[PDB]
Amino acid sequence: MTTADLILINNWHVVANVEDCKPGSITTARLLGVKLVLWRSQEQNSPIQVWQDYCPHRGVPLSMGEVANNTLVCPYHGWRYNQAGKCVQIPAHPDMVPPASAQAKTYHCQERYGLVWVCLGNPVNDIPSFPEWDDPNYHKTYTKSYLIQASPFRVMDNSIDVSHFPFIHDGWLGDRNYTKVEDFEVKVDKDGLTMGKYQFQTSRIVSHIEDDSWVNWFRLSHPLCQYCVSESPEMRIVDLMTIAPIDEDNSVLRMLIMWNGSEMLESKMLTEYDETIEQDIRILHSQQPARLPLLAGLPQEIHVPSDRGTVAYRRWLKELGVTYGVC
Amino acid sequence: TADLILINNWHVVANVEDCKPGSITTARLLGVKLVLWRSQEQNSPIQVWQDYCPHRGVPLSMGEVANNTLVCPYHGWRYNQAGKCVQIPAHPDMVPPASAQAKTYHCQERYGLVWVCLGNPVNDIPSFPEWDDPNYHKTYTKSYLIQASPFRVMDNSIDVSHFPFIHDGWLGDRNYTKVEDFEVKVDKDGLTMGKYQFQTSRIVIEDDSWVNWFRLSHPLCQYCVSESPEMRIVDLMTIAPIDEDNSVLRMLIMWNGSEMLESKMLTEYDETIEQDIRILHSQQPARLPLLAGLPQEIHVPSDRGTVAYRRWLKELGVTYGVC
Amino acid sequence: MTTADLILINNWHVVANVEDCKPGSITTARLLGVKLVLWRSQEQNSPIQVWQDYCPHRGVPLSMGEVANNTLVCPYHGWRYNQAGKCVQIPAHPDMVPPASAQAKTYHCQERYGLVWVCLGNPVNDIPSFPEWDDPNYHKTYTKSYLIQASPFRVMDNSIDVSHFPFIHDGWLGDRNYTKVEDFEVKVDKDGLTMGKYQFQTDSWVNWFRLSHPLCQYCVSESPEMRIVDLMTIAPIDEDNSVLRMLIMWNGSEMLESKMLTEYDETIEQDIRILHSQQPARLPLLAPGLPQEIHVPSDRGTVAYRRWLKELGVTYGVC
Ligand SMILES: N=C1N[C@H]2[C@H](COC(N)=O)NC(=N)N3CC[C@H](O)[C@]23N1
Ligand SMILES: N=C1N[C@H]2[C@H](COC(N)=O)NC(=N)N3CC[C@H](O)[C@]23N1
Ligand SMILES: N=C1N[C@H]2[C@H](COC(N)=O)NC(=N)N3CC[C@H](O)[C@]23N1
Ligand code: FES
Ligand code: FES
Ligand code: FES
Ligand SMILES: [Cl-]
Ligand SMILES: [Cl-]
Ligand SMILES: [Fe+3]
Ligand SMILES: [Fe+3]
Ligand SMILES: [Fe+3]
């Protein structure tokens, strides 16, 4: 269940929140069909290692082992792997020089925005930018992680779509009485995919009742991360959505939300996002085919003008060479 | 995807009582997901469509009926009774594209059942002559979901020699196991099994001689007649072919005795159906073997009806749910 | 999934314990992808029949039927099959001689060591030897069966492996303080695979074992106090699933049985935790997106096992 797609293999993907990787801890993740083990030594400020979850001796998951000092120890015969992935001790043969092949498969890892980013290949692109991270005007919160039984590209398709707001988000992000979708612009260029400012009508639980005209904007430099800005005259909310491609048919959605208003709004922010993410997931789980259809049994997709963003997304994925999770 | 003999035939997918005005229900037929819906209007017709919005591929059954339209939950496109999209809410003054239309199927209500044809209905719905006979009362069994090929289910319903064993004490007698000779005929009226007698009393009592015959004009529907000196019982058994390996069995039962026998009737059928299902779920392979690992089937003279069934399916060019 | 490997099809495999097959009983098992029915008539000391679990009339499992006198009766139309597998009676036609094809597929069965051994092919090899069975100084006990979601050859590989004792069997077969594995000898010849004497420092137990059958292991463990032998059998359900049984004999007091069963239960379950996790599921042989296995000197027995399986031509459950 792996991919040759270099835009996917040679890119950075979130696999965990840094808060879930304590010193001395072992955790697991799955990315693009590969089983990962994440571990840290007990030392303060220890780096996070992200390896293939696999002991090359007899094929046991290293995640079933234990962290000892600065090493991860396999449970079956106790081979110890240092932070660089090299076996430094074979207990049955304490004096031998361990073979060069006694080495875990290691991956590039980088903590950014409080998230653990992993690259399984050779990183040609940087981690997506998130300018408000360093802005002290902005408070932050993290949603829980949502496991979704849909293609990661269908999950992103739904997050680019704006015309569904008055229907599945009626009463939250739209209003069954204002269903018309105002004109907006979309561009695919060196910045990636950008949806220009899009105004829509709704009151929101995180603001005042009369603050009922919102304007959204977003950019994907990476096909599975979205930087979204939602702004009213009273408040500005930004978020970094990341979709972890577990395999072709399963995804993990995470959202890092920041806002330039009272820190007291955090509970309402998480409530709104939980409500709307779950409304989206009900649709996502139902869509067929599972793979995202690109532009070209079941009838072909129909496109109307307010689909210009999701059409541009399908065009972009084709231009990027994506074959994983798309059809 | 099934053969054209199955595609161009009528299959029961629901009881008309399952489909109230304003309601949405679902069914599956020959691998196709179906949505059934009715407006709120009195005596409104049932629409049966493929359960699929062509915009972004959401099941229309997750939507709602509004007036005389079905509305998709995702972006609110509205489909009239003919399946044409009449409104795209994001663009209220835009004429919907001609491609914006649900795939619709033929639907007819008959005998209180919802019949569907996914193709072109060359054949008629099977006949059921007792339906309008004022001497006969009617009842419907519940539907039975069966994890077996629909053609295995029908094979078991054509089989008569198993009565003294898995229906001992209901349709057969373990002391009377011999199967007297009978005639079977396959012609343009389908498969008919001639009269055959089996010595057993039924709960529907010295009435222990029943003469049965049945006809299939349609490989997945069976019209069964059972008559004693005291009473005549007929039934229409319909097998909905969900896919190659799964079936829904329904029976419509009519009888010319007292209507107070209904509860006992439903119990007899429930008992014998579940006795059959226990065998059906166990048979291997799952798909019905036609005439020519696991050994080939063996046929004895009392299998002539189930042998003729397999020959008929081959003549009709059935490849779906058979092996 | 079935195999053509002759070392597997033409060999004997344990499918049941004899005490599990009482007179008049019907039980089921799977072997090498085949569904089996085991049955016995009600008469005393009746033989055990082992057939493919399949009525050739309409494909019903015979195991859903009943034993009547000396016959197994299919539940659907009541065809009666005698102890040789021949259909003797078709009740729809009481006076008819059944078709010659009306016959169960029967397999060779033999009771030995209190176990039911089955050969699905041509018995070329004999059942493995177990000398202490005939020794009145030795008591016997049987573990329960263990269903393991791993290739049977992975299960046997783990049983030949000795260097894992201080880690997953710390406190039972090894000691985390003594992890170095001393030199030992292994031989593969016509008698199969023999591991020579080795001892684990935790007085100490001295052990050796032999496989003449690639899925059966004869183990010997000796300390100054007593001697324990066991016959470990691994039934290959399919390429990815196994049933582990042990027949244990010892010449100490009979009262040790309960503790020994618990010790075996503890260590078997420690092994199963590893076996269920190993990837790939099939045992990798030598010299063929996961890296290839690494071997150190203390792996000499499991290396010799992989070499043996290749020369035996095993393709089922290996990769
Ligand atoms: N659950 C969601 N909340 C929304 C916020 C943006 O703010 C607003 N008002 O939409 N964040 C975000 N990434 N997106 C993409 C899709 C949809 O706009 C949304 N998904
Ligand atoms: N459960 C079952 N009851 C029986 C009744 C008999 O028919 C009548 N009319 O009583 N109906 C029917 N379709 N069949 C087919 C096989 C078997 O005779 C049976 N299956
Ligand atoms: N669970 C296990 N207990 C051990 C006993 C030892 O044998 C005796 N005779 O005591 N039996 C056996 N088959 N083996 C092989 C590996 C390991 O020595 C062991 N596995
Ligand atoms: S399998 Fe990891 S040390 Fe042997
Ligand atoms: S998916 Fe049905 S209206 Fe968009
Ligand atoms: S299936 Fe066994 S007797 Fe008919
Ligand atoms: Cl119609
Ligand atoms: Cl009446
Ligand atoms: Fe949404
Ligand atoms: Fe029956
Ligand atoms: Fe072990």
Residue numbers in the entry:
A (entry chain B): 1 to 296, 304 to 334
B (entry chain A): 3 to 206, 209 to 296, 304 to 334
C (entry chain C): 1 to 202, 212 to 297, 304 to 334
Sentences from the paper on this structure:
To investigate the architectural parameters that dictate the substrate specificity and site-selectivity of a Rieske oxygenase catalyzed reaction, we focused on two Rieske oxygenases, SxtT and GxtA, which are involved in the biosynthesis of paralytic shellfish toxins. These enzymes share 88% sequence identity with one another and selectively install a hydroxyl group on adjacent C12 and C11 positions of a tricyclic saxitoxin scaffold, respectively.
The differentiating feature between β-STOH and ddSTX, the C12 β-hydroxyl group, forms only one additional interaction in the SxtT active site with Tyr198. In SxtT, this loop extends toward the active site and interacts with β-STOH as well as with non-conserved residues Ser230 and Glu272. Accordingly, whereas both orientations of the GxtA loops reveal an open path from the surface of the protein to the substrate-binding site, the SxtT loop, which is tucked into the protein interior, blocks the analogous path in the crystal structure. Outside of considering the overall loop architecture, in SxtT, the loop is important as it interacts with a bound substrate using residue Arg204.
